[PDB]
Symmetry: C3
Subunit: 256 residues, 3 copies
């Protein structure tokens, strides 16, 4: 049998066939587990939690527990997890709070290493790699193809847009734009994820153009509006710059 006898599952929970739940796991009220998802021993699945297919959740992970927000008064809130995610030991992912859409969602193909905290109301994209002891405060946004170094802390409401890379033991207080390389305490910005898209094999003209865009935004002393207005003609010469402009328009806490 794919479900271990010592596992406690609520009747209202739905588990698809071929899904493997190991010993001493707990599944809560109104939760769903997709096909081919493997829960090793000692995994907690909280109430109102949807989990996709081909997920790998290791021991001592709390998936879908109540938020830590002081104002949360036990309302109905939810957590959604996509497909093909590796969630390592001691990971804690909490459901949303009704004050902000009441949901926490994470995408696909993510790697969450040991003791990765995902607080209430967070939004995480796809192809992300969160290293050991990474703590992400509530309402944060993780884009796609993002890497965050070990023992790093993301402050509440902060945006981490696509293809960025946060160094280890970094303190993110402001919004990290796309393709940006940030590190330190307090974290500073020093260059672009050049070697990342080089190791992904992207055209060198695109890398030089994006580099000029970074120079424009950060290393040329312009305000937000003036930089944005400088990005006007480069978009059609190189389309990827769009993702950077979004970073400026979605930035409510400032920039690095």
């Amino acid at each position: 049998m794919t479900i271990h006898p010592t596992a406690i599952i609520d009747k209202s929970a739905m588990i698809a066939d071929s899904a493997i739940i190991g010993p001493y796991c707990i599944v809560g009220k109104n939760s769903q587990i997709g096909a081919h998802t493997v829960l090793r021993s000692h995994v907690i699945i909280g109430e109102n939690t949807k989990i996709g297919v081909h997920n790998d959740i290791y021991q001592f992970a709390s998936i879908g527990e109540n938020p830590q927000d002081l104002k949360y008064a036990g309302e109905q809130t939810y957590l959604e997890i996509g497909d093909h995610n590796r969630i390592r030991e001691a990971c804690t992912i909490h459901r949303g709070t009704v004050q902000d859409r009441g949901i926490t969602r994470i995408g696909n193909q993510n790697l969450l290493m040991v003791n990765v905290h995902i607080a209430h109301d967070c939004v995480v994209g796809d192809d992300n790699v969160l290293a050991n002891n990474v703590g992400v405060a509530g309402h944060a946004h993780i884009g796609n193809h993002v890497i965050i170094g070990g023992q790093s802390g993301v402050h509440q409401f902060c945006r981490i847009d696509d293809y960025s890379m946060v160094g280890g033991a970094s303190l993110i207080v402001k919004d990290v734009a796309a393709y940006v390389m940030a590190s330190g305490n307090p974290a500073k910005a020093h260059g672009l994820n050049k070697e990342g898209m080089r190791r992904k094999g992207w055209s060198k003209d695109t890398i030089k153009a994006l580099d000029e865009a970074y120079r424009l935004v950060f290393r040329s002393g312009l305000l937000r509006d003036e930089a944005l207005d400088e990005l006007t003609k480069l978009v059609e010469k190189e389309p990827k710059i769009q993702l950077l402009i979004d970073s400026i328009n979605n930035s409510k806490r400032g920039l690095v």
Copy 2:
């Protein structure tokens, strides 16, 4: 039944009828759990541990385990927990060592987020909020209504007096006075916690006076004794300044400035 069958409880432990203990929990020798206290599975309660009422302890938390002090040789030491505390996942609170009155104490209405470590012989007051991955070394003192940011580390013997606020990823090596805002590595003083007093509804005159007291202690470059003699003048016109004076007199490791 309020106690799950798969829970292991030693005979010497006392559990109230209103306390609920979930699956796969273990309670040690000579331990006590108060009324209306919720143990949310996979919780370890070590030997010699007293727990108050209306506490909520989440999974994988080790409450009352042996100290990590290299000199601790397995003596009889204790841990006390007050009421209305929410202790989140993976939290580790260790019992005291006989070399320092052999007890670890935490108060009431505390929020301990994921992986909050409370080392041997610590003293924690009430209404405190320790964020994720906060580790506080042995013999430290947490006052009341204190906030400590995520992934922060308090050094052993350090005092964190009332209404202070430690920023995230901060390293506290010295004593943090009352109402002080500290952050960084190494952490430094960055003004007064006017946000705490503005959400709690304090008189603007009181906040301005307390701010002037802060300027006296830190931003007036006079040593601890002259400052103290200057605050004892201000206590008449504003009583809360007392809490600051205590911070100066209770400081043994120095002051975070």
Copy 3:
């Protein structure tokens, strides 16, 4: 009798008679546990894991789990643990990857405090003390008699040679030579670990000579080769300098200066 009924043990695993395994523990394929070893409760022993004698492993610790390397494809890899080790709660030690010898090693008399991560392919010596929330990335080397402060992070491939001491909340990107005291973010060399060799009762002449060696390497503006040839003269009048020379020759990532 020494093994709790609720413990799950694979048939291929070997457990000594004097080894005690508590409730709700799981032992994997082709693993071994030595004599007089204590697994308190809620301990995961992964496949292909060797554990020595007189070890004390606390709850919620994952000993021998699969690596976190993105390229690891589920091959056959191993973890080795020596004797007389105290591994505290939530500790995670992962097996090696076939791309680098395929083994993770830790020595004897080690103290791994709460939530100490030991990534794939690490090598740890003896008499080491890793404090709370210490994360050590893959392929790292920990020497002997090393202390690493709480919430510190060692980057992959970094060397932490013998008798060194890393301060709390430090970020190690480069190799720490022997006897060196490093701390900060980014960490920086801050003198010699005289406290340790004074506690261990070393001759004052030996400590003064070693300090002069530190002055040669770090505080004398000399590149690595001229420094090296200058310590090769000092190695005879005091032998311990050898351990430092190794540090320079074994450094592949540079030096924490």
